[PDB]
Design an enzyme around this catalytic site. Structure first.
Site, PDB file in Angstrom:
ATOM      1  N   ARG A   3     -13.453  -2.228   3.362  1.00 35.64           N
ATOM      2  CA  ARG A   3     -12.940  -3.482   2.845  1.00 35.64           C
ATOM      3  C   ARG A   3     -14.120  -4.433   2.696  1.00 35.64           C
ATOM      4  NH1 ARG A   3      -9.029  -5.951   6.995  1.00 35.64           N
ATOM      5  NH2 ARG A   3      -7.866  -4.031   6.537  1.00 35.64           N
ATOM      6  N   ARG A  70     -11.747 -13.019   9.536  1.00 39.80           N
ATOM      7  CA  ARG A  70     -11.358 -12.162   8.411  1.00 39.80           C
ATOM      8  C   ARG A  70     -11.508 -12.891   7.082  1.00 39.80           C
ATOM      9  NH1 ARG A  70     -10.814  -7.307  11.436  1.00 39.80           N
ATOM     10  NH2 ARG A  70      -9.319  -6.345   9.998  1.00 39.80           N
ATOM     11  N   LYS A 114      -8.817 -11.006  16.083  1.00 42.52           N
ATOM     12  CA  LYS A 114      -9.246 -11.371  14.741  1.00 42.52           C
ATOM     13  C   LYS A 114      -8.757 -12.786  14.430  1.00 42.52           C
ATOM     14  CE  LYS A 114      -7.427  -7.616  13.029  1.00 42.52           C
ATOM     15  NZ  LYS A 114      -6.892  -6.524  12.125  1.00 42.52           N
ATOM     16  N   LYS A 116      -8.023 -15.558  11.392  1.00 41.45           N
ATOM     17  CA  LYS A 116      -7.736 -15.656   9.962  1.00 41.45           C
ATOM     18  C   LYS A 116      -7.646 -17.113   9.477  1.00 41.45           C
ATOM     19  CE  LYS A 116      -5.617 -11.153   9.840  1.00 41.45           C
ATOM     20  NZ  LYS A 116      -4.449 -10.293   9.510  1.00 41.45           N
ATOM     21  N   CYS A 333       2.997  -3.122   2.781  1.00 39.57           N
ATOM     22  CA  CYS A 333       1.656  -2.814   3.218  1.00 39.57           C
ATOM     23  C   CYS A 333       1.339  -1.377   2.782  1.00 39.57           C
ATOM     24  CB  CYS A 333       1.544  -2.986   4.731  1.00 39.57           C
ATOM     25  SG  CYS A 333       2.516  -1.750   5.635  1.00 39.57           S
ATOM     26  N   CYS A 339      -2.815   4.765   6.872  1.00 36.96           N
ATOM     27  CA  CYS A 339      -2.738   3.991   8.099  1.00 36.96           C
ATOM     28  C   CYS A 339      -2.372   4.842   9.287  1.00 36.96           C
ATOM     29  CB  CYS A 339      -1.783   2.814   7.992  1.00 36.96           C
ATOM     30  SG  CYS A 339      -1.917   1.709   9.432  1.00 36.96           S
ATOM     31  N   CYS A 378       4.856  -1.060  10.161  1.00 42.19           N
ATOM     32  CA  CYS A 378       4.885  -1.062  11.613  1.00 42.19           C
ATOM     33  C   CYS A 378       4.944  -2.545  11.939  1.00 42.19           C
ATOM     34  CB  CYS A 378       3.675  -0.330  12.218  1.00 42.19           C
ATOM     35  SG  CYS A 378       2.100  -1.238  12.332  1.00 42.19           S
ATOM     36  N   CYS A 382       1.294  -6.469   8.595  1.00 45.02           N
ATOM     37  CA  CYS A 382       0.427  -6.573   7.427  1.00 45.02           C
ATOM     38  C   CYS A 382       1.148  -6.880   6.105  1.00 45.02           C
ATOM     39  CB  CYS A 382      -0.431  -5.318   7.316  1.00 45.02           C
ATOM     40  SG  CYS A 382      -1.219  -4.838   8.899  1.00 45.02           S
TER      41      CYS A 382
HETATM   42  C1  SRM Z   1      -4.477  -3.897   3.483  1.00 42.75           C
HETATM   43  C2  SRM Z   1      -3.594  -4.729   4.478  1.00 42.75           C
HETATM   44  C3  SRM Z   1      -2.066  -4.639   4.064  1.00 42.75           C
HETATM   45  C4  SRM Z   1      -1.809  -4.643   2.565  1.00 42.75           C
HETATM   46  O1  SRM Z   1      -1.083  -3.772   2.071  1.00 42.75           O
HETATM   47  O2  SRM Z   1      -2.334  -5.513   1.865  1.00 42.75           O
HETATM   48  C5  SRM Z   1      -3.838  -4.310   5.916  1.00 42.75           C
HETATM   49  C6  SRM Z   1      -3.981  -3.024   6.390  1.00 42.75           C
HETATM   50  C7  SRM Z   1      -4.138  -2.634   7.686  1.00 42.75           C
HETATM   51  N1  SRM Z   1      -4.153  -3.487   8.737  1.00 42.75           N
HETATM   52 FE1  SRM Z   1      -3.586  -5.412   8.751  1.00 42.75          FE
HETATM   53  N2  SRM Z   1      -3.758  -5.433   6.724  1.00 42.75           N
HETATM   54  C8  SRM Z   1      -3.693  -6.560   5.932  1.00 42.75           C
HETATM   55  C9  SRM Z   1      -3.294  -7.807   6.308  1.00 42.75           C
HETATM   56  C10 SRM Z   1      -2.898  -8.156   7.559  1.00 42.75           C
HETATM   57  C11 SRM Z   1      -1.886  -9.255   7.814  1.00 42.75           C
HETATM   58  C12 SRM Z   1      -1.374 -10.202   6.775  1.00 42.75           C
HETATM   59  C13 SRM Z   1      -2.334 -11.306   6.403  1.00 42.75           C
HETATM   60  O3  SRM Z   1      -3.376 -11.439   7.066  1.00 42.75           O
HETATM   61  O4  SRM Z   1      -2.050 -12.050   5.444  1.00 42.75           O
HETATM   62  C14 SRM Z   1      -1.477  -9.173   9.100  1.00 42.75           C
HETATM   63  C15 SRM Z   1      -0.342  -9.946   9.700  1.00 42.75           C
HETATM   64  C16 SRM Z   1      -0.709 -11.335  10.125  1.00 42.75           C
HETATM   65  C17 SRM Z   1      -1.473 -11.358  11.415  1.00 42.75           C
HETATM   66  O5  SRM Z   1      -2.670 -11.032  11.406  1.00 42.75           O
HETATM   67  O6  SRM Z   1      -0.883 -11.723  12.449  1.00 42.75           O
HETATM   68  C18 SRM Z   1      -2.130  -7.929   9.650  1.00 42.75           C
HETATM   69  C19 SRM Z   1      -2.045  -7.478  10.961  1.00 42.75           C
HETATM   70  C20 SRM Z   1      -2.653  -6.383  11.495  1.00 42.75           C
HETATM   71  C21 SRM Z   1      -2.653  -5.994  12.935  1.00 42.75           C
HETATM   72  C22 SRM Z   1      -1.945  -6.745  14.039  1.00 42.75           C
HETATM   73  C23 SRM Z   1      -3.048  -7.565  14.665  1.00 42.75           C
HETATM   74  C24 SRM Z   1      -2.579  -8.443  15.793  1.00 42.75           C
HETATM   75  O7  SRM Z   1      -3.117  -9.549  15.923  1.00 42.75           O
HETATM   76  O8  SRM Z   1      -1.685  -8.036  16.552  1.00 42.75           O
HETATM   77  C25 SRM Z   1      -3.393  -4.818  12.960  1.00 42.75           C
HETATM   78  C26 SRM Z   1      -3.776  -3.893  14.077  1.00 42.75           C
HETATM   79  C27 SRM Z   1      -4.770  -4.524  15.015  1.00 42.75           C
HETATM   80  O9  SRM Z   1      -5.590  -5.352  14.572  1.00 42.75           O
HETATM   81  O10 SRM Z   1      -4.723  -4.192  16.211  1.00 42.75           O
HETATM   82  C28 SRM Z   1      -3.836  -4.489  11.570  1.00 42.75           C
HETATM   83  C29 SRM Z   1      -4.373  -3.286  11.167  1.00 42.75           C
HETATM   84  C30 SRM Z   1      -4.532  -2.801   9.868  1.00 42.75           C
HETATM   85  C31 SRM Z   1      -5.247  -1.542   9.422  1.00 42.75           C
HETATM   86  C32 SRM Z   1      -6.715  -1.910   9.138  1.00 42.75           C
HETATM   87  C33 SRM Z   1      -4.994  -0.349  10.327  1.00 42.75           C
HETATM   88  C34 SRM Z   1      -5.953  -0.067  11.452  1.00 42.75           C
HETATM   89  O11 SRM Z   1      -6.106  -0.918  12.346  1.00 42.75           O
HETATM   90  O12 SRM Z   1      -6.546   1.022  11.459  1.00 42.75           O
HETATM   91  C35 SRM Z   1      -4.503  -1.262   8.196  1.00 42.75           C
HETATM   92  C36 SRM Z   1      -5.269  -0.444   7.275  1.00 42.75           C
HETATM   93  C37 SRM Z   1      -4.392   0.649   6.690  1.00 42.75           C
HETATM   94  C38 SRM Z   1      -4.924   1.139   5.368  1.00 42.75           C
HETATM   95  O13 SRM Z   1      -5.151   2.346   5.227  1.00 42.75           O
HETATM   96  O14 SRM Z   1      -5.136   0.315   4.458  1.00 42.75           O
HETATM   97  N3  SRM Z   1      -3.368  -5.470  10.751  1.00 42.75           N
HETATM   98  N4  SRM Z   1      -2.839  -7.307   8.621  1.00 42.75           N
HETATM   99  C39 SRM Z   1      -4.165  -6.205   4.567  1.00 42.75           C
HETATM  100  C40 SRM Z   1      -5.647  -6.233   4.505  1.00 42.75           C
HETATM  101  C41 SRM Z   1      -6.151  -7.607   4.848  1.00 42.75           C
HETATM  102  C42 SRM Z   1      -7.600  -7.805   4.486  1.00 42.75           C
HETATM  103  O15 SRM Z   1      -8.021  -7.309   3.425  1.00 42.75           O
HETATM  104  O16 SRM Z   1      -8.313  -8.472   5.248  1.00 42.75           O
HETATM  105  S1  SF4 Z   2       1.832  -3.094   9.032  1.00 46.07           S
HETATM  106 FE1  SF4 Z   2       1.313  -1.285  10.275  1.00 46.07          FE
HETATM  107  S2  SF4 Z   2       1.576   0.482   8.812  1.00 46.07           S
HETATM  108 FE2  SF4 Z   2       1.402  -1.358   7.585  1.00 46.07          FE
HETATM  109  S3  SF4 Z   2      -0.804  -1.418   6.996  1.00 46.07           S
HETATM  110 FE3  SF4 Z   2      -0.441  -2.764   8.870  1.00 46.07          FE
HETATM  111  S4  SF4 Z   2      -0.975  -1.401  10.628  1.00 46.07           S
HETATM  112 FE4  SF4 Z   2      -0.624  -0.053   8.845  1.00 46.07          FE
END
Ligand code: SRM
Ligand code: SF4
Ligand code: NA
Length: 469
Positions: A3, A70, A114, A116, A333, A339, A378, A382
């Site tokens: 990314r 981020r 992280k 944001k 997502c 993922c 999940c 995301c």
């Molecule tokens: C691509 C994306 C979803 C999408 O379809 O667009 C994404 C994809 C993934 N997110 Fe996310 N997140 C994405 C926005 C976010 C958001 C929404 C937002 O920021 O607008 C959230 C929810 C809001 C929040 O942060 O509270 C989010 C909360 C998470 C979490 C939960 C973190 C936490 O604080 O509890 C994880 C897992 C972790 O970090 O432990 C995570 C983990 C992941 C990972 C990187 C999986 C991993 O940890 O190995 C996923 C990658 C899977 C893949 O193959 O692409 N992602 N993730 C977004 C990429 C953001 C970016 O480019 O920077």
């Molecule tokens: S919501 Fe869960 S399954 Fe979907 S991209 Fe984020 S970590 Fe992966």
């Protein structure tokens, strides 16, 4: 997975051409995936290409620079088009000011979790500010930005059955003149760094820190550290979170063509060469592209004379295929197959799911209407289902938790309505629920608000206390 750090989602045609090439040659999947945080991802990079990828990013002036800050988001297509430049310049500054010096700001142990951040230009909330820790809501006067309203503490991640975790919306701290921006940004990061619970990672986030110490306590420290006193919040309103699909007029003879890209997945499909069409536009486009928070792409600053040029390619490539207003307002997502934390499909389920929702919308005579509908694979959240009117939270293969109650602008968290149910059960609920909205809704009343007003779902008034039943 790779990314990029792409402040405000602005990427040049030259940089674009570089990413289209690498994604095509050097990745298993060969696609470009626009994320909802205004950046791109590659899926399946072979370990041999891990070096050439960083070089490739760098040669075009890009970087992928974790428990850090981020991608800083910024409203992609403001109604008052002129406001974008200084807002974008500010998102870019905040992004750079928050970068690790490798740590006077980040700290040696860095951050508990992280962090944001976003720059919002009302009335648009397309960046979904309540999903972020630090938010800068742009206040303008006479076409010039004058300051920012600061909202802190957003976060969506929850853990199934864990009442200790919750999604929380951002709290208002106050108004800060434009000059205090970096100071305030720095102060919020450092107090979170210091106060943020580092032992238990599930409680490290700012939304938790805020609930433990209190907004006002957190606020005072931010003012103390920043060397400022917050002024009263200046009036701001939002009207939506969607993109402006199609052409809209920018400044001068400039126009913007936002293309709806389903799941932000850019790949050439039989008869819909989305990836090549974008390469083709990239080669003749005078300007930048903008990756939106709705995983769409804006072909920005197209001179009026070039409209037909670009439209010809977008049209021929299937980039302008008409979709219902519902599909345009739905998000999911990535989830499987990439993922590792995935429980239920999201990106690979949304398309057909929406086909079903479109039928229901049609059946009820509301096909020109839309419900902010999001599916997250999940509970990490995301897909931002925890800010949707209807949110599906993956619990296991083919089973999701159904949340209802959010609103169109995304300032309310949807309470769980039904648990661990399958698609046919999900549709049966919505068939009925949409049926009622179509017939009982007031003038211009959204689905979310309807469910809340019609006693269908109790609203979540204070996430830390009443989100869980
Ligand atoms: C691509 C994306 C979803 C999408 O379809 O667009 C994404 C994809 C993934 N997110 Fe996310 N997140 C994405 C926005 C976010 C958001 C929404 C937002 O920021 O607008 C959230 C929810 C809001 C929040 O942060 O509270 C989010 C909360 C998470 C979490 C939960 C973190 C936490 O604080 O509890 C994880 C897992 C972790 O970090 O432990 C995570 C983990 C992941 C990972 C990187 C999986 C991993 O940890 O190995 C996923 C990658 C899977 C893949 O193959 O692409 N992602 N993730 C977004 C990429 C953001 C970016 O480019 O920077
Ligand atoms: S919501 Fe869960 S399954 Fe979907 S991209 Fe984020 S970590 Fe992966
Ligand atoms: Na999209």
């Amino acid at each position: 997975l790779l990314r990029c750090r792409l402040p405000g989602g602005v990427i040049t045609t030259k940089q674009w051409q570089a990413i289209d090439k690498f994604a095509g040659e050097n990745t298993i999947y060969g696609s470009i995936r626009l994320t909802n945080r205004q950046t791109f991802q590659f899926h399946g990079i072979l370990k041999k290409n891990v070096k050439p990828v960083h070089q490739m990013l760098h040669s075009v002036g890009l970087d992928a620079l974790n428990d850090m800050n981020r991608n800083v988001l910024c409203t992609s297509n403001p109604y008052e088009s002129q406001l974008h430049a200084e807002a974008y310049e500010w998102a870019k500054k905040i992004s750079e000011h928050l970068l690790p010096r490798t740590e006077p700001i980040l700290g040696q142990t860095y951050l508990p979790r992280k962090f944001k951040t976003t720059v919002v230009i009302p009335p648009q909330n397309d960046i979904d500010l309540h999903a972020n820790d630090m938010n800068f809501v742009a206040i303008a006067e006479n076409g010039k930005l004058v300051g920012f309203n600061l909202l802190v503490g957003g976060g969506l991640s929850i853990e199934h059955g864990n009442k200790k975790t919750y999604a929380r919306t951002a709290s208002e701290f106050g108004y800060l003149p434009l000059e205090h921006t970096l100071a305030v940004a720095e102060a919020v990061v450092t107090t979170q760094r210091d106060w943020g619970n580092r032992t238990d990672r599930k409680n490290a986030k700012t939304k938790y820190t805020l609930e433990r110490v209190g907004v006002e306590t957190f606020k005072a420290e931010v003012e103390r550290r920043a060397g400022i006193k917050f002024e009263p919040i200046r009036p701001y309103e939002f009207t939506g979170r969607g993109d402006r699909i199609g052409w809209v007029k920018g400044i001068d003879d400039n126009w913007h063509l936002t293309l709806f890209i389903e799941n932000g997945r850019i790949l050439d499909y039989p008869a819909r060469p989305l990836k090549t069409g974008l390469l083709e536009i990239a080669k003749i486009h005078k300007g930048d592209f903008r990756i939106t928070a709705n995983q769409n792409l804006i072909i920005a600053g197209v001179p009026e004379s070039e409209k037909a040029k670009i439209e010809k390619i977008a049209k021929e490539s299937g980039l302008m295929n008409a979709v219902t207003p519902q599909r345009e307002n739905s998000m999911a997502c990535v989830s499987f197959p990439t993922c590792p934390l995935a429980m239920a499909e999201a990106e690979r389920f949304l398309p057909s799911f929406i086909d079903n929702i479109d039928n229901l919308m049609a059946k009820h005579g509301v096909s020109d209407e839309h419900i902010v509908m999001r599916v997250t694979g999940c509970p990490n959240g995301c897909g931002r289902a925890m800010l949707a009117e209807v949110g599906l939270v993956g619990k296991a293969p083919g089973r999701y938790n159904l949340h209802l109650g959010g609103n169109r602008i995304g300032t309310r968290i949807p309470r769980m309505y039904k648990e661990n149910i399958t698609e046919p059960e999900i549709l049966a609920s919505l068939d009925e629920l949409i049926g009622r909205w179509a017939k009982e809704r007031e003038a211009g009343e959204g689905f979310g608000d309807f469910t809340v007003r019609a006693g269908i779902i109790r609203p979540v008034l204070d996430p830390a206390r009443d989100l869980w039943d």
